[PDB]
Q: What sequence folds into this?
């Protein structure tokens, strides 16, 4: 029954909003990702060019095999970026190994 | 008010631990799922029969098209089920429509 803290050396962590750098033209563009050895997760700018959207991450595993482009992670809508025509989509999945990827965006 | 509550008619919600009904033999078995018209999510029993695991949900969309078994959602490891040889994996994705699915479990 002990309590410990991380209060950034008694300063607290100071937050300002991370502003979007919305792509100049691309219909879909990776914002950021992290692979920590167990989880592959990230954030993706998605242009609101149609109501129905499907966004997926296609990847090559730990030995750089794409498995006929069959290693797939689905992204989820996170929310619109206010004042822009882009939205944030996020993804996160347990992944044993990953060497490369690209993003696929399907509109109807 | 500016603050509202749901306190179950002043009784509070009473939580009993939901005990696992581990499959009697299956290597992978759906526990539960929910589709609410926007999000398709759920929970899956996965037998710990090898260290390396990949668990995916393959589904047919809103007009019952499988797209050659190409509509894929990746599940993530949630935790072991204490005292059993099964684990919980979960999944959740934004999905426009879905009519059917099955689960695929790859060990290595
Ligand atoms: Cl610190
Ligand atoms: Cl990220
Ligand atoms: Cl639109
Ligand atoms: Cl995850
Ligand atoms: Cl109460
Ligand atoms: Cl009561
Ligand atoms: Cl569920
Ligand atoms: Cl659909
Ligand atoms: Cl069918
Ligand atoms: Cl185990
Ligand atoms: N996914
Ligand atoms: N409260
Ligand atoms: N309530
Ligand atoms: N309450
Ligand atoms: Na501290
Ligand atoms: Na300070
Ligand atoms: Na402070
Ligand atoms: Na990044
Ligand atoms: Na791998
Ligand atoms: Na592809
Ligand atoms: Na079964
Ligand atoms: Na269910
Ligand atoms: Na799989
Ligand atoms: Na448990
Ligand atoms: Na998922
Ligand atoms: Na069927």
A:
């Amino acid at each position: 029954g002990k309590t410990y803290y991380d209060n950034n050396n008694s300063a607290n962590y100071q937050v300002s909003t991370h502003m979007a750098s919305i792509p100049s033209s691309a219909s879909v563009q990776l914002d950021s990702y992290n692979y920590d050895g167990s989880t592959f997760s990230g954030k993706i700018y998605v242009k609101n060019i149609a109501y129905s959207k499907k966004v997926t991450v296609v990847y090559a595993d730990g030995s750089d095999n794409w498995n006929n482009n069959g290693n797939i992670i689905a992204a989820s809508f996170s929310g619109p970026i206010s004042g822009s025509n882009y939205e944030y989509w996020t993804f996160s999945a347990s992944v044993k190994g990953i060497k490369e990827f690209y993003i696929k965006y399907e509109v109807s």
User: Anything to note?
Assistant: Chain A touches chain B at residues 39, 52-54, 56, 70, 72-77, 89, 92-96, 108 (CB under 8 Å). Chain A has one domain: 1-108. The radius of gyration of chain A is 17 Å.
